[PDB]
Amino acid sequence: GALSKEILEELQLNTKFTEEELSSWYQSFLKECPSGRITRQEFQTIYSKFFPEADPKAYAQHVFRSFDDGTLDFKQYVIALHMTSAGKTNQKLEWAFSLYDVDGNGTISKNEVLEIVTAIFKMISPEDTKHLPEDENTPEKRAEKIWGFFGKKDDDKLTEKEFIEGTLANKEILRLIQFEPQKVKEKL
Numbered sequence: 689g690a691l692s693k694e695i696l697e698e699l700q701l702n703t704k705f706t707e708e709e710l711s712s713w714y715q716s717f718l719k720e721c722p723s724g725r726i727t728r729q730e731f732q733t734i735y736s737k738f739f740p741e742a743d744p745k746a747y748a749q750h751v752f753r754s755f756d757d758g759t760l761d762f763k764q765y766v767i768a769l770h771m772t773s774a775g776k777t778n779q780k781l782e783w784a785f786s787l788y789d790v791d792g793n794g795t796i797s798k799n800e801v802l803e804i805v806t807a808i809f810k811m812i813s814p815e816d817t818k819h820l821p822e823d824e825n826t827p828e829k830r831a832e833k834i835w836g837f838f839g840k841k842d843d844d845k846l847t848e849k850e851f852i853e854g855t856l857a858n859k860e861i862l863r864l865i866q867f868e869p870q871k872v873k874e875k876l
């Protein structure tokens with residue numbers, strides 16, 4: 689049951705579990721996935737199961753990739769769940785950058801923002817989308833607003849430094865880049 693203190697370090701005060709509790713979870717985990725590794729397909733299924741009202745395939749895929757297809761270990765699988773469903777968005781900005789930097793080349797492009805914003809948009813039920821502000825109710829509008837808030841040109845590249853600054857300072861950027869299905873819904 690090693691990676692548990694590793695899980696808590698990389699999670700810190702963000703963890704919603706203790707080492708003894710993570711081990712129990714870990715124990716159940718191994719019963720279901722003996723190898724302790726979970727594939728992208730299996731990960732996607734978790735979200736498809738628990739987000740019946742939406743279409744979480746792309747979202748789950750992007751989340752899985754943020755940890756580098758292939759497989760995730762228990763530590764990543766636990767952290768991945770925390771990133772999407774627990775804690776404060778503010779303690780996840782470094783990870784959020786990893787999420788938005790789709791190809792992982794170190795910077796975020798305009799298209800990459802559209803990719804993630806679209807994936808996140810599909811996590812919203814059709815029902816709740818009518819509550820979205822007019823200038824923020826379609827993937828294109830939201831991604832473009834985000835790009836505008838960072839004052840970028842179509843071919844500009846957004847750095848981690850700037851990403852973190854703006855998501856911290858400009859609360860409208862935070863609202864727009866928001867990736868937690870429940871938080872997006874609640875703010876609406």
Ligand SMILES: [Ca+2]
Binds near residue numbers: 791
């Ligand atoms: Ca990139």
